[PDB]
């Protein structure tokens, strides 16, 4: 019967590895939350980047021609040298 007791004692030998697995499973289930975080960061930090990187980050969809008709810097609406 000590044999039975040996197994019943040993069934919990690897507690540290089981608790690590549980927390990894939690971390796995949080990974999908990146799909909303990373874009939201770039959305807020877009204006910090330079014009050249704004274009790459958007795959060319944004460029200087896409700056508003009334750009926040009035002297640079329609380009760095103005409209004409």
């Amino acid at each position: 019967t000590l044999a039975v007791y040996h197994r019943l004692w040993g069934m919990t030998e690897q507690f540290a590895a089981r608790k690590k697995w549980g927390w990894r499973q939690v971390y796995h289930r949080m990974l999908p939350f990146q799909i909303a975080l990373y874009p939201s960061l770039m959305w807020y930090l877009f204006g910090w980047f330079d014009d050249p990187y704004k274009e790459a980050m958007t795959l060319g969809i944004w460029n200087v021609s896409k700056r508003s008709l009334y750009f926040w810097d009035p002297l640079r609406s329609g380009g760095d040298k103005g409209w004409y």
């Binding site: 799909i35 909303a36 874009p39 409209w83």
Partner: protein
């Protein structure tokens, strides 16, 4: 009739109106069937992280193109009256 008195009561036409319960009728179901064929629920809404990503990514792209549309609307309404639309002629 009886409007404006203690005898006020619903007219016959208001009562006939409330007799039309439209039970069993569904005339707008076509729109929901068609919207459900876009699979937005199975792909984005059902999962919370994906629902958040739809609101974020959809708000990033929606905000940009909404601005784009109303910029073009403005450029058209004010055609000929904007600085860009009237290059200045320097005096000789």
């Amino acid at each position: 009739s009886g409007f404006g008195t203690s005898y006020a009561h619903d007219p016959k036409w208001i009562e006939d109106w409330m007799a039309r319960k439209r039970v069993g009728v569904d005339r707008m179901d076509w729109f929901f069937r068609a919207f459900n064929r876009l699979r937005l629920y199975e792909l984005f809404f059902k999962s919370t992280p994906r629902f958040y990503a739809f609101m974020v990514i959809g708000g990033l792209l929606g905000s940009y193109y909404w601005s784009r549309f109303w910029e073009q609307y403005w450029i058209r309404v004010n055609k000929g009256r904007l600085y860009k639309d009237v290059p200045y002629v320097y005096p000789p």
